[PDB]
């Protein structure tokens, strides 16, 4: 079934003694490992609620964004998934001043498209210096803000592995009343984020299957074939 407990054998504990007491309702008593373990039933209910919520909102084609900026493994998985399916994603950090205003994205994407069509119509007819420089800025800008060019409206929901790890972006989402899902570890505030998902990221399985499940939810919400919604096959991936 959805959000099954089969994969939840290594799903608890991310950090030790750096915790928020305001997150205690979503967790189970500690062990000698000092890892902040998670209740697997309340987490399952919250995951189901978030799944049906995102399914409903993205069936009407609500704008959804992806922000995964982990070191190499979760980042690579997000890159592969978001390249496979035509979805919006920003796999790099946030410098601010983008989510706040659509006017700060309209001109940016206009210039991006202008540079793309220029490079498509340029064949080193000018000096090699200008062509190489322009390609360099295109690659540099697209490496952060290049995975999203299909949006014409405001975002409606965000997905973040750890809000404190991207607090600036959270601030950019705090101005709007839009909801947001987050894999809060132990040190978050359940008032700046609407959906509370008690989960860890110290283990590959937890975060990878969470991200894949969200990706399949969004894909199926866009009238696409189902990939992982009730399958009991636990894909095996290790952090590397």
């Amino acid at each position: 079934s959805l959000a099954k407990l089969g994969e939840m054998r290594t799903h608890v504990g991310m950090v030790k003694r750096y915790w928020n007491p305001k997150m205690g309702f979503f967790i189970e008593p500690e062990r000698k490992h000092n890892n902040d373990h998670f209740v697997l039933e309340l987490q399952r209910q919250s995951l189901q609620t978030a799944y049906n919520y995102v399914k409903e909102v993205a069936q009407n084609n609500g704008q959804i964004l992806f922000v995964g900026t982990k070191n190499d493994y979760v980042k690579k998985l997000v890159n592969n998934i978001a390249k496979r399916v035509d979805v919006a994603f920003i796999t790099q950090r946030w410098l601010g001043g983008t989510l706040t205003n659509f006017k700060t994205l309209s001109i940016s994407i206009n210039k991006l498209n202008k540079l793309v069509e220029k490079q498509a119509e340029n064949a080193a007819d000018l000096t090699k210096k200008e062509n190489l420089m322009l390609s360099r800025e295109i690659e540099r800008l697209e490496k952060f803000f290049g995975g999203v060019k299909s949006l014409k409206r405001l975002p409606n929901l965000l997905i973040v592995d750890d809000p404190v790890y991207e607090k600036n972006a959270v601030a950019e989402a705090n101005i709007l009343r839009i909801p947001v899902v987050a894999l809060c570890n132990t040190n978050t505030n359940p008032e700046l984020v609407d959906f509370i998902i008690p989960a860890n990221n110290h283990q590959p399985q937890s975060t990878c299957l969470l991200m894949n499940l969200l990706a399949d939810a969004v894909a199926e919400a866009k009238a696409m074939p189902t990939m992982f919604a009730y399958k009991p096959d636990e894909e095996i991936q290790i952090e590397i």
Partner: peptide, 5 residues
């Protein structure tokens, strides 16, 4: 914001 509008 339970419903989408």
């Amino acid at each position: 914001m339970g419903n989408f509008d």
